[PDB]
Amino acid sequence: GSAPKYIEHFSKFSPSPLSMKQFLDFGSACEKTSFTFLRQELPVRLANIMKEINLLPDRVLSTPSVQLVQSWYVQSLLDIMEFLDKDPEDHRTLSQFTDALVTIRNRHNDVVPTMAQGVLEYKDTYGDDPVSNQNIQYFLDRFYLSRISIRMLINQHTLIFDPKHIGSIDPNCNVSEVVKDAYDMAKLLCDKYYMASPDLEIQEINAANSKQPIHMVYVPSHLYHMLFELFKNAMRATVESHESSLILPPIKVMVALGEEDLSIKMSDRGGGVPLRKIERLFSYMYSTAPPLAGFGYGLPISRLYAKYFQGDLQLFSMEGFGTDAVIYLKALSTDSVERLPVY
Amino acid sequence: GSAPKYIEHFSKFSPSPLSMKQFLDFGSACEKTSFTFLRQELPVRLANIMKEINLLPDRVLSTPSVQLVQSWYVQSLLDIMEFLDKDPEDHRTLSQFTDALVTIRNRHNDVVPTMAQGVLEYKDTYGDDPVSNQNIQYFLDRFYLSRISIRMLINQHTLIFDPKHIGSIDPNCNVSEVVKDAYDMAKLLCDKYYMASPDLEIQEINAANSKQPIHMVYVPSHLYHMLFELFKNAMRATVESHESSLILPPIKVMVALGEEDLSIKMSDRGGGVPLRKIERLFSYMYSTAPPLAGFGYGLPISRLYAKYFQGDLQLFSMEGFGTDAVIYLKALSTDSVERLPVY
C-alpha cells in the first residue's frame, strides 16, 4: 500500500491554524468549501503526527499500544484520501464524506486509555527516570494537541452539515453558566461518594465594563471539561482534608475580563501541595498507574485544551492551606487562533 | 601573572553547598576552621564563575563593562591566594585575612549597575532578539547566583569573627515581623511619592500547630529584600490603578507553614498583567533601560535569593484585577542547602 508515501508527501505541508473568525465564517451556504479545505487539511495534520510517531525509538514503536493507533490513523488517512479527486458539485459526494468523518470519529475514541497502556508498559519495561518523562511529556503533549485539532475540525463539519451555536462554538458563551454547571455536576458526584460538599462562590470582574455579565466566543465543551476536572480536584481535597473537622470552606471562583486575557481562578482551602510535587500532576508518566478518580479528562489534557486557543492552565498552591488553579483564555476572538505542533 | 592557571586549576573542583546546619555550626571556638575552609572554597567558587565568564563570545567579553568585573574577580582571587600557605595557628594570619575579605566585599558592590551597562550596550549594539535574551538570562542568573553564594560566605565570616543571631542568619526569624517592616518602609516611600498608600492584611496558617507564631531559620536580610521589592511593586500598581477612584484596596499577605514549604503570598488588586507580558518582568534585558523605581534589588534578583536556599518566587496575575506573588521557602533547616551553579 501507500501509507508511507502518502505520509511523506503530506508532511511536507504545514498545518493551517484557524481563528474563531474563520471557524464562525464556515458556518453561515458553504458546505462544499468546508469539504475542499478538509480533504486537504486533514491529511496534512494526520500525516504530521504520523510522521512524528514513526520517529519514536523501535522499543516504543513496536509496543502493541502504539502499533494499534498507528493502524487507526492509517485507515483514517486513507478513508479521506478516497475523496481527493471526487467532485465537490455532487450533492452525494459531500454526503458520503460526512459519513466517512463520523466513522473516523468512532475509531479514535479509545486512544487515551490505549496510550496509557504504552506508558505503563514502558514504565515497567524500561523505567521512570526523569529523561524518559521529558520524552513522554514531549510526545504526548504534541500528539494529544494534534488530536484535539483534528476533532475540532471534524466536529465543526458534522455538526454544521447534518443562528445561535455554530457547531461546537458559542459566540455568546456565558462563562458563569459554564462554571455553575461544571460545579453542579461535580457537586453531584461529590455528594454521592462523600456525603458532604463545598459550596461555590462565583465573583466576576469586568474591567472595561464595570458590570456586564462576562460573555465570550469559545467552545464551551472544552471549557466545561476543564472546569469539571478542576472542581473534582478541589472537592476531593477540600472534603478529605476536613473529615476530622466540621466547618467546610467553599470553593471560590473569580472570573476576570481584561483587555486581552479572560482568566478563571478557582481557589480551594484543601491543604495544598508542596511546590516540589506540583509538576508531577501534569506528567502523564508520574500520573498513570493500574474514589471519583474515574471522571474527567485528566489535568494534562485540560491544560492542552487551554493552550489550544493560545491559553494556559496553571496551578499554584500553599502547603498547609490550599490551591489556586487558573485558566487563562484570550478575551478577543481575533487572538483565538489554533495552536498546533509542527513537523 | 597566573590568573588563567589559578583559574584552570580551581575550576576542576566542584563548589561545596552548605546547609543552615553547617552555617550555624561554624558559629559556636572555630575561627581557624572557617579560615582553612574558605581559603579553599572561595577560590573554587571564584574560579568557576570566572571560567564561565571567559567562555562568553568575544563581542561580549571585550566590552568595557565585562573587562572591568573580570578585573575585580582576578584581584579578589589573588588576594585570597596569598593565604593558601600562611599558618592557621597564627592569631595574626587570621586577622589580615578578615581585613582581606572586607576589602574584597567593597570592590564588588557596583557589579549590578556595571552589568546593566553591558546589557545595555549589547541591546543597542547587537539587538534584543529572544535568542539573545535566553543567553543573557542564562548567564546572569548563574553569575548573580554565584555572587550571592560568595557574599553569604564572606559576611558569615566577617560578622562572626570581628547567642541570638549567628551572622546574617536568625535561627528564630519571625516571618510576620519581617513582613511588617518591609511594608512600613515601602509605605514610607509610597506615602512620600504618592500621598495615598494601601493598608496591609497579614494572616497566618500554621497547619501543624494550629496557632503558634510562624518562626523559621533564615537569612532575614534576604527575605527583607524580597518582600520589599514586592511591596513596592504592589503599592505602585495599586495606587496608580486607582487614582481616578476613591476606595483603595489593601495588600493582603498570607504566610502558610506546611510540612516542607513555608510560603508567602502577597495579593494586590492593582489591575494586573496579561499573561503574555509576565516572563518579561523577570528578564534582565527587557527590564534594563536608561517614580520609586530606584529602590529594591530587582525582581530577577529577588527570585535568585529564593532559589538560593531551594525556594522560588513566582508571579501569577489576572488582568483586570491584580496580581499574586508568592515566595516559596523550605520550612526545614535540613532542606535549606545552598543552591549553586556548576562548571
Ligand SMILES: Cc1cnc(Cl)nc1-c1ccc(N(Cc2ccc(CNC(=O)C(F)F)cc2)C(=O)c2ccc(O)cc2O)cc1
Ligand atoms: C490529581 C487528582 C486527580 N483526581 C482527583 Cl479526584 N484528585 C486529584 C488531586 C486533587 C487535589 C490534589 N491536591 C493535593 C491534595 C491531596 C489530598 C488532599 C486531602 N488531604 C488528605 O487526604 C489528607 F491526607 F491530608 C488535599 C490536597 C491539590 O492540592 C490540588 C491539586 C489540583 C487542584 O486543582 C486542586 C487541588 O487542591 C492533588 C490531586
Ligand SMILES: Cc1cnc(Cl)nc1-c1ccc(N(Cc2ccc(CNC(=O)C(F)F)cc2)C(=O)c2ccc(O)cc2O)cc1
Ligand atoms: C516591575 C516594577 C518595577 N518597579 C516598580 Cl515601582 N513597579 C514594577 C511593576 C509593578 C507592577 C506591575 N504590574 C503591572 C501593573 C502596572 C501598572 C499598574 C497601574 N495601572 C496604571 O498605571 C494604569 F495605567 F492602568 C498596575 C499593574 C503588576 O501587575 C505587578 C507585578 C509584580 C508585582 O509584584 C505586583 C504587581 O501588581 C508591573 C511592574
Ligand SMILES: CC(C)c1ccc(COc2ccc(CC(=O)NCCN)cc2Cl)cc1
Ligand atoms: C506510550 C507512548 C506515548 C510513549 C512511551 C514512551 C516514550 C518514550 O520515548 C523515549 C524515551 C527515551 C528517549 C531517550 C533515548 O535514549 N533516545 C534515543 C532514541 N533511539 C527517547 C524517547 Cl522517544 C514515548 C512514547
Ligand SMILES: CC(C)c1ccc(COc2ccc(CC(=O)NCCN)cc2Cl)cc1
Ligand atoms: C552584559 C553581559 C551580562 C552579557 C551580555 C550579553 C550576553 C549575550 O551572550 C550571548 C548572546 C548570543 C549568543 C548566541 C551565539 O550566536 N552564540 C555563539 C557564541 N560565539 C551567545 C551568547 Cl553568550 C551575555 C552576557
Ligand SMILES: [Mg+2]
Ligand atoms: Mg504550574
Ligand SMILES: [Mg+2]
Ligand atoms: Mg512565573
